[PDB]
Amino acid sequence: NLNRHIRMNFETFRSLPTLKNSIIPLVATSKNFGSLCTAIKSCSFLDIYNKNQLSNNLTGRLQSLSDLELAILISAARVALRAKDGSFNFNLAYAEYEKMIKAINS
Amino acid sequence: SDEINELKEMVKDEHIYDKLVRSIAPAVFGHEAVKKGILLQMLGGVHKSTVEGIKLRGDINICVVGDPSTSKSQFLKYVVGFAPRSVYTSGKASSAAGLTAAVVRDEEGGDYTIEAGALMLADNGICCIDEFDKMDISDQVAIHEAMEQQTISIAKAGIHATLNARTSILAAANPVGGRYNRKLSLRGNLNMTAPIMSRFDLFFVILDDCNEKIDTELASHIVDLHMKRDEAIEPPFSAEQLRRYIKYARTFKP
Numbered sequence A: 001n002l003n004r005h006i007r008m009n010f011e012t013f014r015s016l017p018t019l020k021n022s023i024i025p026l027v028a029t030s031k032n033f034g035s036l037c038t039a040i041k042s043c044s045f046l047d048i049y050n051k052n053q054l055s056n057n058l059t060g061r062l063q064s065l066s067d068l069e070l071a072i073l074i075s076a077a078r079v080a081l082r083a084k085d086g087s088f089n090f091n092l093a094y095a096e097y098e099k100m101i102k103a104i105n106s
Numbered sequence B: 001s002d003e004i005n006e007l008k009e010m011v012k013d014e015h016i017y018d019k020l021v022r023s024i025a026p027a028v029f030g031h032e033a034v035k036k037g038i039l040l041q042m043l044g045g046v047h048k049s050t051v052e053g054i055k056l057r058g059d060i061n062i063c064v065v066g067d068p069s070t071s072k073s074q075f076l077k078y079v080v081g082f083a084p085r086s087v088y089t090s091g092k093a094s095s096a097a098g099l100t101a102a103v104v105r106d107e108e109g110g111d112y113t114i115e116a117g118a119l120m121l122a123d124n125g126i127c128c129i130d131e132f133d134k135m136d137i138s139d140q141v142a143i144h145e146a147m148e149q150q151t152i153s154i155a156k157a158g159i160h161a162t163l164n165a166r167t168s169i170l171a172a173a174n175p176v177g178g179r180y181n182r183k184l185s186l187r188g189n190l191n192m193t194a195p196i197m198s199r200f201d202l203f204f205v206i207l208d209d210c211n212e213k214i215d216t217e218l219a220s221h222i223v224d225l226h227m228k229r230d231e232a233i234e235p236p237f238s239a240e241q242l243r244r245y246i247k248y249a250r251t252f253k254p
């Protein structure tokens, strides 16, 4: 596994200190030798580390939204799509949202 | 008394209205909106006149308008083969004069007389049509009186007459740009004036969009069709007992 993670870092980042920042916790977090050996054999902690590093750039944000936020968002995006410049007011977002809800009820 | 049992069955069943609607387009896949719209077409209203003052229409005119490959011509070329006394006209090939009534001369008395046309020989049956948009207004006009006033009136070559055409109509025109911008609205997107847009007591702007849990089913369906052996298409009610069941139900005037 560790080899695979190293290769991943190389292909994407190609930067040692990044991998170093990844290693620091994995090593320092362990309490017993067997646990650390298990870790470096599986390197599972690198998964959580990548994830958290990645947690909320743009997808995690999108995932942590409730229903109505998502509705406003979708409808506003549709309004941006209609107009050429993408520039959409708030009123346009609301009107489109309202007619979408009218449809869902319909 | 015998056939009374057959009706008794096909009418005392609980879910006939569903058993019927999903059994009007055995080949077509789904569209449970439109299939309903058709099943209601063949079952007219009452056309009962008012107080001696006037008479009002009692018929329905569903008018599909759909994106490309929506199987909108299939419904027609089916109905016109299953609805009694019906007629299928491509429209743009035809002319308005032909559609309502023709005036022509006969050598018997050297006098002008009437040609029934699609509308008059389509009386008490669905007169389906294709590609309204393609039909220039010069022929779009000649229909209106066969929509609401229910009767055509003609004053040509000396003959003045008026013939009642109690005829359901239909349509399958395509949107303006062949396929219509989801971007644009619907107002400046249908390219048809207000009246003929109103007289259609249904409206079905059919879309066509991408998906997986749909397009897979649709493809499997079309394939099974082209796989003659897999004509599992048998719906509950045959395309025959539906006819007799209608010819009964046509008489209730609730």
Ligand SMILES: Nc1ncnc2c1ncn2[C@@H]1O[C@H](COP(=O)(O)OP(=O)(O)OP(O)(O)=S)[C@@H](O)[C@H]1O
Binding pocket: B027, B028, B029, B066, B067, B068, B069, B070, B071, B072, B073, B074, B173, B174, B218, B221, B222
């Ligand atoms: N929902 C569907 N399910 C199965 N087959 C379909 C469906 N829609 C279309 N088809 C097939 O694809 C062909 C095209 O159908 P249509 O789009 O109805 O053609 P059409 O009526 O000429 O359309 P326009 O608007 O007049 S060009 C038909 O021959 C159908 O067999």
